[PDB]
Coordinates of C-alpha atoms and ligand atoms in Angstrom, one line a residue:
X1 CA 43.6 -135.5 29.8
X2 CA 47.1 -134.3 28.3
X3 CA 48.4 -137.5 29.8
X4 CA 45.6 -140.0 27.3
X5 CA 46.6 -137.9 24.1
X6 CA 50.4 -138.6 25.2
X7 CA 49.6 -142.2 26.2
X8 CA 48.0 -142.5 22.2
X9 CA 51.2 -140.7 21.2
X10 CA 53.1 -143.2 22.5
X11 CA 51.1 -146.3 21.1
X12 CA 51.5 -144.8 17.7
X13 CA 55.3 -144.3 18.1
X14 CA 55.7 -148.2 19.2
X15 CA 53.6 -148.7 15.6
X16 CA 55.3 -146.5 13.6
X17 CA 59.0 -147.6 14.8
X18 CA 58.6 -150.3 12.6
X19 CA 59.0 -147.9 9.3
X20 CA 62.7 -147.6 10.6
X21 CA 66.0 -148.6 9.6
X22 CA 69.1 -148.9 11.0
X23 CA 72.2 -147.5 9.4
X24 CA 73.5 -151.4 9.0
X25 CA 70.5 -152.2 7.5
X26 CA 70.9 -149.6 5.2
X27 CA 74.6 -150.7 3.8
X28 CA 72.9 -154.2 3.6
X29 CA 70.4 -153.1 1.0
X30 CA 73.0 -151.4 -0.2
X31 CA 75.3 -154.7 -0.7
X32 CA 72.6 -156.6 -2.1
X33 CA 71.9 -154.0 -4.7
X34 CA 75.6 -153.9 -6.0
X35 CA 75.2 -157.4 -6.1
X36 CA 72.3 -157.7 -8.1
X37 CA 73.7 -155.0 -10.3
X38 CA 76.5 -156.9 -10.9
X39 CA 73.9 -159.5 -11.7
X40 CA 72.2 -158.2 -14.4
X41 CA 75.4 -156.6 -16.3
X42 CA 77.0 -160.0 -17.1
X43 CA 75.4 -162.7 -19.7
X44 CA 75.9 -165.8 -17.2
X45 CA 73.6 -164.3 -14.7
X46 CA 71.2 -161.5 -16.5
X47 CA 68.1 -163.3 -17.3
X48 CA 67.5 -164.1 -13.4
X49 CA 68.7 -160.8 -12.3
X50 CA 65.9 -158.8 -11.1
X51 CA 67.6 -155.4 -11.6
X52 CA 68.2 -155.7 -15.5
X53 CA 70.8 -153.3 -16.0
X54 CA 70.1 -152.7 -19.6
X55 CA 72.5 -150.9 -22.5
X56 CA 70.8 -147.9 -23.6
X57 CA 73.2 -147.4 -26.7
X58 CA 73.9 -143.7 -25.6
X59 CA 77.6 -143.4 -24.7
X60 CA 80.1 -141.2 -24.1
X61 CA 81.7 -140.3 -27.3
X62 CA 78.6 -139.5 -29.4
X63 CA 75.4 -133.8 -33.3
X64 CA 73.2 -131.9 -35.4
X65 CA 71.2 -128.5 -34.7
X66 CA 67.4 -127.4 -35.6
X67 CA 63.9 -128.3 -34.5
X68 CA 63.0 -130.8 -32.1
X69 CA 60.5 -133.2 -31.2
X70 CA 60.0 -134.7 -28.0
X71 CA 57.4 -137.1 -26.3
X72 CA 57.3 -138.0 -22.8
X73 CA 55.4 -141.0 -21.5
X74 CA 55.6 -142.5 -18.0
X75 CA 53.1 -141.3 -16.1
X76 CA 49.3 -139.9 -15.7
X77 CA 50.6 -137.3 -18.7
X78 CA 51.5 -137.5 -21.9
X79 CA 53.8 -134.6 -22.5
X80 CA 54.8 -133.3 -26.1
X81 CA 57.6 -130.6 -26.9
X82 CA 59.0 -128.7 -29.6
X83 CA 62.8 -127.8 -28.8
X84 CA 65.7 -126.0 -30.2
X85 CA 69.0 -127.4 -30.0
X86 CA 72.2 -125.4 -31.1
X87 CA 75.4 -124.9 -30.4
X88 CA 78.3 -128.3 -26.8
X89 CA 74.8 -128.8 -27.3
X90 CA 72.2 -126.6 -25.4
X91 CA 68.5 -126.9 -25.6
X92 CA 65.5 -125.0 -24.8
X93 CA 61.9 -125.7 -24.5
X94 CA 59.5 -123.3 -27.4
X95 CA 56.4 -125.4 -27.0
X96 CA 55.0 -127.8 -25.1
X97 CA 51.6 -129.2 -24.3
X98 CA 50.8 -132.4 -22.3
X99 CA 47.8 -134.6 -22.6
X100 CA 45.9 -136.4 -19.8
X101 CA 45.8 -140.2 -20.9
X102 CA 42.0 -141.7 -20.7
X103 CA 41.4 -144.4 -18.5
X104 CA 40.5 -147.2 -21.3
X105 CA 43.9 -146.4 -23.0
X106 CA 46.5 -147.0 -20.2
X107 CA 44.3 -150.1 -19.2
X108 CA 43.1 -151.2 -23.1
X109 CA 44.9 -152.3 -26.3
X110 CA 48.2 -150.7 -27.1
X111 CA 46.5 -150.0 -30.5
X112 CA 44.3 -147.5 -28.1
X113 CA 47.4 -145.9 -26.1
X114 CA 49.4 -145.3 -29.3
X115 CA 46.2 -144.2 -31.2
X116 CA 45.7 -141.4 -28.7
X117 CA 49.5 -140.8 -28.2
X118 CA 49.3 -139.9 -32.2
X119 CA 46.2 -137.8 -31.6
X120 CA 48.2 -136.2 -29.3
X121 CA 50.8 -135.2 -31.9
X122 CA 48.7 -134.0 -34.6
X123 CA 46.9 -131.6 -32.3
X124 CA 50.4 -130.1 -31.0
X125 CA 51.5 -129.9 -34.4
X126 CA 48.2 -128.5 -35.0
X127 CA 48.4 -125.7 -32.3
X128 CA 51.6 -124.5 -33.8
X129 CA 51.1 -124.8 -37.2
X130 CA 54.1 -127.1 -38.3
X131 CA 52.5 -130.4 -39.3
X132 CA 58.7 -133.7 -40.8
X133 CA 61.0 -133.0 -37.0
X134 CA 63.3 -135.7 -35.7
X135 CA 61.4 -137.2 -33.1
X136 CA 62.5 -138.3 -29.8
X137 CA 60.3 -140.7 -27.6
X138 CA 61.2 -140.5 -23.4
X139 CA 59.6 -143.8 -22.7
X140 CA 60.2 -144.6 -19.3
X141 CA 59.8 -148.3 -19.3
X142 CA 62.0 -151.4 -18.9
X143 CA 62.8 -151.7 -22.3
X144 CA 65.6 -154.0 -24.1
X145 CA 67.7 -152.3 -27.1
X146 CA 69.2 -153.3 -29.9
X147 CA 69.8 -149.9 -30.4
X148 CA 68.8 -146.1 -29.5
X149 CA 65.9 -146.3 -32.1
X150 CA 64.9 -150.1 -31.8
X151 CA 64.0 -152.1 -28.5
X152 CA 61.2 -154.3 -26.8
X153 CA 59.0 -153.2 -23.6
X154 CA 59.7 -156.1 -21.4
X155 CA 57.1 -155.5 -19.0
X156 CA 55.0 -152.4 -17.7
X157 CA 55.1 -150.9 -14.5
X158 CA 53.0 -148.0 -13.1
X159 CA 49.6 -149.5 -13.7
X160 CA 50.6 -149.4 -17.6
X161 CA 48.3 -152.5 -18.8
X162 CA 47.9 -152.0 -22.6
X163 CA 47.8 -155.5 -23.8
X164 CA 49.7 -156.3 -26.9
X165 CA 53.1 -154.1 -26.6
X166 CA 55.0 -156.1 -24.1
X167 CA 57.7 -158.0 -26.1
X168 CA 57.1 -155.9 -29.4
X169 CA 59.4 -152.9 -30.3
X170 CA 58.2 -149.6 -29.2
X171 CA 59.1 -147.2 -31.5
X172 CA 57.3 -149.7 -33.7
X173 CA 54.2 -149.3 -32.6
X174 CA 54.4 -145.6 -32.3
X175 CA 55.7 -145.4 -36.1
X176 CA 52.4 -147.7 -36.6
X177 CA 49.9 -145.9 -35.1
X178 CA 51.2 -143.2 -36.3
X179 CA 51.0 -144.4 -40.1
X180 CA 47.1 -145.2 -39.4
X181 CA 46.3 -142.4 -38.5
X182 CA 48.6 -140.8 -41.6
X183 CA 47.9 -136.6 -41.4
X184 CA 51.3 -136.1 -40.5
X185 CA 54.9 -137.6 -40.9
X186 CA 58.0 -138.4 -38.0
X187 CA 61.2 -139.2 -38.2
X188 CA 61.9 -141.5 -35.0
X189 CA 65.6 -141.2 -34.5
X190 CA 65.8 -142.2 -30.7
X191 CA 64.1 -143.3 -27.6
X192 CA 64.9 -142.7 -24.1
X193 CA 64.4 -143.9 -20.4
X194 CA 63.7 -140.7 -18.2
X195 CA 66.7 -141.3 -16.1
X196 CA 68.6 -141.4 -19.6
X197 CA 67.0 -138.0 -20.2
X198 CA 67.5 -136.5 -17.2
X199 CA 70.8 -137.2 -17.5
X200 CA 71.5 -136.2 -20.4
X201 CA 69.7 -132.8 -20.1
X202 CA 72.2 -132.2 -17.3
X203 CA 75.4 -132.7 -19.2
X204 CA 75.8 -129.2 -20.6
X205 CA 76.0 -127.2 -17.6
X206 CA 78.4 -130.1 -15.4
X207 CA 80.2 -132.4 -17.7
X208 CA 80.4 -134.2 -14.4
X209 CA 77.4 -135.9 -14.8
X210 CA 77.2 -139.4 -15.5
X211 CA 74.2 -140.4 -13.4
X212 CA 70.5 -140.0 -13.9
X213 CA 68.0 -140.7 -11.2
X214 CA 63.5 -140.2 -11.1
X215 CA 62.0 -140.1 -7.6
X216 CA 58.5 -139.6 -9.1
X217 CA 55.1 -141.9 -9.4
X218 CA 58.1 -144.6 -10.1
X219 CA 62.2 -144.6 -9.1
X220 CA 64.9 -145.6 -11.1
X221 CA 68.7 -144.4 -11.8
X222 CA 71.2 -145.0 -14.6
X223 CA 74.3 -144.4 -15.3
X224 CA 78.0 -144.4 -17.3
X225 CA 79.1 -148.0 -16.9
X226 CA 82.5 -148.6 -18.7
X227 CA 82.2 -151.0 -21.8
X228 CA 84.2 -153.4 -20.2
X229 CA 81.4 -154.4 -18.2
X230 CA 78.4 -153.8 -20.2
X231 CA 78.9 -157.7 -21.0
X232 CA 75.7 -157.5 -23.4
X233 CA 77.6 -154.9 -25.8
X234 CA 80.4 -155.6 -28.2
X235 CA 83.6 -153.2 -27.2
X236 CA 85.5 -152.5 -24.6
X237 CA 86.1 -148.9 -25.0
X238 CA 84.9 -146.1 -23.1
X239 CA 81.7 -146.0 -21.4
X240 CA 77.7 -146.6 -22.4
X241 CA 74.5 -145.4 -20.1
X242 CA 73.2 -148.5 -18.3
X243 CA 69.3 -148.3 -17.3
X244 CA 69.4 -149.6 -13.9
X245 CA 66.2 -150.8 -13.6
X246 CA 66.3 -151.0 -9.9
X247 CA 62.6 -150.6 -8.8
X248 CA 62.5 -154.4 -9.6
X249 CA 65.3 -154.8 -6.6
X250 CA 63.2 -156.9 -4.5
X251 CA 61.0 -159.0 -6.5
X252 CA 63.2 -162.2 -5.8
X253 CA 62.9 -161.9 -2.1
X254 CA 65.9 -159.6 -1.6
X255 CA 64.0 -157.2 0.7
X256 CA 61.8 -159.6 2.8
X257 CA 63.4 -159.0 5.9
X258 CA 62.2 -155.3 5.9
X259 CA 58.7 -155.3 4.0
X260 CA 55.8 -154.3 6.1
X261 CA 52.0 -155.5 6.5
X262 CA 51.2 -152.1 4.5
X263 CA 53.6 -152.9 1.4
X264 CA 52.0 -156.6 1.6
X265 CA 48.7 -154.8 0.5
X266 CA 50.2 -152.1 -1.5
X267 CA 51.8 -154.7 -3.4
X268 CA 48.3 -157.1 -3.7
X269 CA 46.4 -153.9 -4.3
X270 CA 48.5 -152.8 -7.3
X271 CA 48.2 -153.4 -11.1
X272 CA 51.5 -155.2 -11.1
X273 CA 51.7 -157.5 -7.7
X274 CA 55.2 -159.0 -7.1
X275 CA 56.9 -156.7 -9.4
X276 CA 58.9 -153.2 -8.5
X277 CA 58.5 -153.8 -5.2
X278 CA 61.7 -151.3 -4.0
X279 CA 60.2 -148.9 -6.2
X280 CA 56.8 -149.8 -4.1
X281 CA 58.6 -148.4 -0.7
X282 CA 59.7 -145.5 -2.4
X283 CA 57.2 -143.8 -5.5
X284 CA 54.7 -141.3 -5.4
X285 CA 52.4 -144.1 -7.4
X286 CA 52.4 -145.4 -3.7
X287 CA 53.5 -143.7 -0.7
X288 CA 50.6 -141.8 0.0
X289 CA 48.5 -145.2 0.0
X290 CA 51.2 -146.2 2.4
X291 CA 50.3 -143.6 4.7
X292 CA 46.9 -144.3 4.0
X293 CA 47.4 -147.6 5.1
X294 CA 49.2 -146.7 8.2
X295 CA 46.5 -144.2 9.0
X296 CA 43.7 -146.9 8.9
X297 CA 45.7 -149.3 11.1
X298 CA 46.0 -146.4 13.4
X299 CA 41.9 -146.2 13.5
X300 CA 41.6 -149.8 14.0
X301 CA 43.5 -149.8 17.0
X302 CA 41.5 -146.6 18.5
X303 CA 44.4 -143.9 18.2
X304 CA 43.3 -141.9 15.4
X305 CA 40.0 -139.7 14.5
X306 CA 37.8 -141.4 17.4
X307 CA 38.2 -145.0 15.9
X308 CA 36.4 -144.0 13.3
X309 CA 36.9 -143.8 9.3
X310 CA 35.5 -141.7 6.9
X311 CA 34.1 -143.3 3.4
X312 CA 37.2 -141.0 1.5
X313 CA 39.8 -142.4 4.3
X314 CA 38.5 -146.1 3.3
X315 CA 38.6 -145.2 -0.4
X316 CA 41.6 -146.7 -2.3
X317 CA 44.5 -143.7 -3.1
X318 CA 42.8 -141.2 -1.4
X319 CA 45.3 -140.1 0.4
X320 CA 47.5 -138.5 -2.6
X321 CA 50.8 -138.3 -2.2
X322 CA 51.2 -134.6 -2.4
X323 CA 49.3 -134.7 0.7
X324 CA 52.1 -136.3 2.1
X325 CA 54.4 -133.4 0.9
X326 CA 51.4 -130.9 2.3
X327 CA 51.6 -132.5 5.7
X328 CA 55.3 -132.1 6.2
X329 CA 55.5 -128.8 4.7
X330 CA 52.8 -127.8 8.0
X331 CA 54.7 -125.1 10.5
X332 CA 53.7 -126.2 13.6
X333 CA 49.7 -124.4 13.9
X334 CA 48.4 -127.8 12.4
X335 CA 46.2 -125.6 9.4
X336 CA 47.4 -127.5 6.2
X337 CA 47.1 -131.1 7.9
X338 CA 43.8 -130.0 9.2
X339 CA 42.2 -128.8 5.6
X340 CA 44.0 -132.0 4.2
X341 CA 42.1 -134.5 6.5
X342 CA 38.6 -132.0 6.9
X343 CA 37.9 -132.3 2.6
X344 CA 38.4 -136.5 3.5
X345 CA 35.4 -135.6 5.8
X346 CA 37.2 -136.4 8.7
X347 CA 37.2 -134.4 12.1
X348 CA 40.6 -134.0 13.2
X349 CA 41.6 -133.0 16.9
X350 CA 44.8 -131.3 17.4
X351 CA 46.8 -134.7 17.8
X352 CA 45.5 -136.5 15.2
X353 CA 46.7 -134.0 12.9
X354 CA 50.4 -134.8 15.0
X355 CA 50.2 -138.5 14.0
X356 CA 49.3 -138.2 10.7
X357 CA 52.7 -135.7 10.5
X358 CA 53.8 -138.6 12.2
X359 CA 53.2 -141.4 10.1
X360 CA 53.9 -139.1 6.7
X361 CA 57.1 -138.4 8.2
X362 CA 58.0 -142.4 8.8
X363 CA 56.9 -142.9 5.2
X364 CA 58.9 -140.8 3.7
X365 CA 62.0 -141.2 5.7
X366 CA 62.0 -144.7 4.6
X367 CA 61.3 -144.0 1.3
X368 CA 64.0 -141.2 1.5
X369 CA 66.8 -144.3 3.2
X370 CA 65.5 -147.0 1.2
X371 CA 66.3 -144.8 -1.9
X372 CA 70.0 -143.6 -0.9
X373 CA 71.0 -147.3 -0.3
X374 CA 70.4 -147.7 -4.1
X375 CA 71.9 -144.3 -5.2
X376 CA 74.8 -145.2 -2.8
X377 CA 75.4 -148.3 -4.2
X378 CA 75.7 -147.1 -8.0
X379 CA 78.3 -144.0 -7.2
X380 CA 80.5 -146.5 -4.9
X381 CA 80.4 -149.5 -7.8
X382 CA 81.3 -146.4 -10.5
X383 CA 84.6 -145.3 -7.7
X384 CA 85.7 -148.6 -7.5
X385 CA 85.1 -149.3 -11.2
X386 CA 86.9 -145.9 -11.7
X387 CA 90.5 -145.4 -11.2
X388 CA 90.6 -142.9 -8.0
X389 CA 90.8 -142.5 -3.7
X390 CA 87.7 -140.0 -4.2
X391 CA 85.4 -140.1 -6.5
X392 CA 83.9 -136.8 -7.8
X393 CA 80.5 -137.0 -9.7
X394 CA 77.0 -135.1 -10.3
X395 CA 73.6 -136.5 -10.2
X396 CA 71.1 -135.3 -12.5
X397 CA 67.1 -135.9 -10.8
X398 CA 63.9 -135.3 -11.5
X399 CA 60.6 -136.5 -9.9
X400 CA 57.9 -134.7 -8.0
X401 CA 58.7 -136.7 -4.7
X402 CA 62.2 -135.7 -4.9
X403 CA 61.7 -132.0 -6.0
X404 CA 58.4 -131.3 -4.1
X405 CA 58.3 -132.5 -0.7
X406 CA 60.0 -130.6 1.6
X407 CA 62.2 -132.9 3.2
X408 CA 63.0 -136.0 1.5
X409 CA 66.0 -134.4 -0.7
X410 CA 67.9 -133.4 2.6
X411 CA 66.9 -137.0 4.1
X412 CA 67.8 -138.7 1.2
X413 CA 71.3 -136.2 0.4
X414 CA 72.6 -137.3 4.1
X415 CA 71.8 -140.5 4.1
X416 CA 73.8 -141.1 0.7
X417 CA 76.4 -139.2 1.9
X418 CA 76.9 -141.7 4.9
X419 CA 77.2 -144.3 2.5
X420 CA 79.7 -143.1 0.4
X421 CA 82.9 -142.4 1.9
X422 CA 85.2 -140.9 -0.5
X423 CA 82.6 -139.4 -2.8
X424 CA 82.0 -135.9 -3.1
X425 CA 78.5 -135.9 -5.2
X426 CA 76.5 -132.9 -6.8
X427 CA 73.2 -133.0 -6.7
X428 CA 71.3 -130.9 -9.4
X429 CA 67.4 -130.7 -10.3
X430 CA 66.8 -130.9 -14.0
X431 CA 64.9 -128.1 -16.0
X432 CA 62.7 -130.1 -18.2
X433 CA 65.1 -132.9 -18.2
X434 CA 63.3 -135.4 -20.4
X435 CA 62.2 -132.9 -23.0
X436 CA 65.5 -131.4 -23.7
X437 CA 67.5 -134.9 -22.9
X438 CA 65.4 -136.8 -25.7
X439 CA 66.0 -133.7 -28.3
X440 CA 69.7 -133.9 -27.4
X441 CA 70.0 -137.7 -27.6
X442 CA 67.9 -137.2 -30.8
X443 CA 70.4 -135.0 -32.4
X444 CA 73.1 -137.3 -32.1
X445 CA 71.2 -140.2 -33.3
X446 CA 70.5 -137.7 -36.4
X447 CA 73.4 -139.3 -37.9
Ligands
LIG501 N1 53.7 -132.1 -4.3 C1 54.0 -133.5 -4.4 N2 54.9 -134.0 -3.5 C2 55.2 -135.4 -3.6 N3 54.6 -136.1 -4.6 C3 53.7 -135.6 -5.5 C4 53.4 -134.2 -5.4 N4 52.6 -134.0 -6.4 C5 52.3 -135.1 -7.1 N5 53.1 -136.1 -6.5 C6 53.2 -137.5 -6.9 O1 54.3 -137.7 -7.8 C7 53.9 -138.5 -9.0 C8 54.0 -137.6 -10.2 O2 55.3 -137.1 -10.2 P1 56.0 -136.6 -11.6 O3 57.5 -136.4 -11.2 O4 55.2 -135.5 -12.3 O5 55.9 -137.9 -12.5 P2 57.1 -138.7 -13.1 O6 58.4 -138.1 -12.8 O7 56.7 -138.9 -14.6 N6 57.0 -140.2 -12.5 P3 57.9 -141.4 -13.1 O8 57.7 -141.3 -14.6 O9 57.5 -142.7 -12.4 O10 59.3 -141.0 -12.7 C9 52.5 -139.0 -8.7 O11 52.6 -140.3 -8.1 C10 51.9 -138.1 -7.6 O12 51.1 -138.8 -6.7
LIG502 O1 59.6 -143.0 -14.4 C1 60.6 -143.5 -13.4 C2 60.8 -145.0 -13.6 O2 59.7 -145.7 -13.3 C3 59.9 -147.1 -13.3 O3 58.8 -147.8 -12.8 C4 60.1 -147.5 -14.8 O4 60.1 -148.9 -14.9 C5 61.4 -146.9 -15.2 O5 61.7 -147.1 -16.6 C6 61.4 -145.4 -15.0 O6 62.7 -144.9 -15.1
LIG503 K1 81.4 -155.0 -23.6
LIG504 MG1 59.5 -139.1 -16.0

């Protein structure tokens, strides 16, 4: 019967309703992000905040030319790149190669992540036969500065686990490891979040760039916050990059009313439970486990793949995110959501391959709403901070979430733009942001 597959279509829409949000619900995230970014910017109020909004030290009047490098590490890769930066600044990417970081040394001894970061290094400079570069590090981590080349990891995120670097100064232990190891020689002159980068990397095509924003494994955003309020900074004058933190929104109960059963267990599941729990509804570390999640709830109640779950289906990130991206990129004939769910040994019917579309699409939508609410709420505190009726600004963004799936971007470009009345925002895609951002923060720190 058409009418029992429409009846199950139903059952999972009553289910899946629950992933929405209302457009009021939306400018009450949004609310209680300005406030906690408000929060975390003055000294009375920032060690509770939970979004940190921490000085980054790059500002707005800040260069030198030559060779460049650049290390990236934030997620499953470790990424290293020689760049050229001349004359403002452009900056091009000449060599690159990234490294897949082991197991033991995300989850080990910081000794062990910053040993093999340094391998890293020597074999690039090997491979190109140039083994003393200023060195910038994209680090894309909360970290507290006391300046561009000097700050403290407060905590991981991302299932980072190396014991023994939280509370210690980064670039420290990279210069450490680094001098163990002693086959070749850095000069560490700056490092960067990835949003910072991004940024940054951004500036030389549209001056009108002052925010920087990752929808990847993680989600973050920063931007040009005047002096005036960077409360933890001496000076008043003109304007400083603020690292938002905002994936940490959440952690002290600011978005209970809208967390899920599925998020609970994301959450618990997770290397890090009670922490960057906004970024949880919203990274590619976690939304295909979400839909995973959704998917099994869906089997449980008899409405998906006969009731029954296959051993991949039950096994924990299975469901990758770009499989999420893969579903919602299908054309209607059902062919990439049925190889997707076939190699997880399941055998889908025509409309179970419709409610997994289904529940993919209720994922990301929220994660695509959630996420404007946030971006929403930084570009209407920087109007009102500013001294104009319309605010004009670009947003530099990189991420695979943002940049891969095929309709999250123009979810997530409308839903901002409800929210911000009186803002005319570009949206541009950086080309190797965090490369040619850390080289080009670098040469200014050259100084
Ligand atoms: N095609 C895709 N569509 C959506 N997500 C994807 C896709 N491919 C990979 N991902 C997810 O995106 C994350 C990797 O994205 P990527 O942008 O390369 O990392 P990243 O930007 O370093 N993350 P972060 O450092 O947290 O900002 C992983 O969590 C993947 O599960
Ligand atoms: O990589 C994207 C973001 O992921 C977050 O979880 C990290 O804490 C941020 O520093 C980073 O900007
Ligand atoms: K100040
Ligand atoms: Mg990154």
């Amino acid at each position: 019967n058409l009418y029992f597959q429409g009846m199950k279509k139903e059952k999972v829409e009553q289910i899946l309703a629950e992933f929405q949000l209302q457009e009021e619900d939306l400018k009450k995230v949004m609310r209680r992000m300005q406030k906690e970014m408000d929060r975390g910017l003055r000294l009375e109020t920032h060690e509770e905040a939970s979004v940190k909004m921490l000085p980054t030290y790059v500002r707005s009047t800040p260069s030198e030319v030559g060779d460049f490098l650049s290390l990236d590490l934030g997620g499953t890769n470790f990424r290293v790149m020689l760049v050229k930066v001349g004359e403002g600044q452009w900056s091009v990417k000449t060599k690159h190669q990234m490294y897949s970081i082991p197991e033991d040394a995300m989850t080990g001894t910081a000794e062990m992540l910053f040993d093999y970061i340094s391998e890293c290094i020597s074999d690039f400079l090997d491979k190109h036969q140039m083994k003393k570069l200023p060195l910038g590090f994209t680090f894309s981590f909360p970290v507290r500065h006391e300046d561009i080349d000097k700050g403290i990891l407060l905590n991981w995120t991302k299932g980072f686990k190396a014991s023994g670097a939280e509370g210690n100064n980064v670039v420290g232990l990279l210069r450490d490891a680094i001098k163990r190891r002693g086959d070749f020689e850095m000069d560490v002159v700056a490092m960067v979040n990835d949003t910072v980068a991004t940024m940054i990397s951004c500036y030389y095509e549209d001056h009108q760039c002052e925010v920087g924003m990752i929808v990847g494994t993680g989600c973050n955003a920063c931007y040009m916050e005047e002096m005036q309020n960077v409360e933890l900074v001496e000076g008043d004058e003109g304007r400083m990059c603020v690292n938002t933190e905002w994936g940490a929104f959440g952690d002290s109960g600011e978005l209970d009313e809208f967390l899920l059963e599925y998020d609970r267990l994301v959450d618990e599941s997770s290397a890090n439970p009670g922490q960057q729990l906004y970024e949880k509804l919203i990274g590619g570390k976690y939304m295909g486990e979400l839909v995973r999640l959704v998917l099994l709830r869906l089997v449980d109640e008899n409405l998906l793949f006969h009731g029954e779950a296959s051993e991949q289906l039950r096994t924990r990130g299975a469901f990758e995110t770009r499989f999420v991206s893969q579903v919602e990129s299908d054309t209607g004939d059902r062919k990439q959501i049925y190889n997707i769910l076939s190699t997880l040994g399941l055998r889908p019917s025509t409309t179970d391959c419709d409610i997994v579309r289904r529940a993919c699409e209720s994922v990301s939508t929220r994660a695509a709403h959630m996420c404007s609410a946030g971006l929403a709420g930084v570009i209407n505190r920087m109007r009102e901070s500013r001294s104009e009726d319309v605010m004009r600004i670009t947003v530099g963004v990189d991420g695979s979430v943002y940049k891969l799936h095929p309709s999250f971007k123009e979810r997530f470009h409308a839903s901002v733009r409800r929210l911000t009345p009186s803002c005319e925002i570009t949206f541009i895609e950086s080309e190797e942001g965090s490369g040619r951002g850390a080289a080009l923060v670098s040469a200014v720190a050259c100084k």
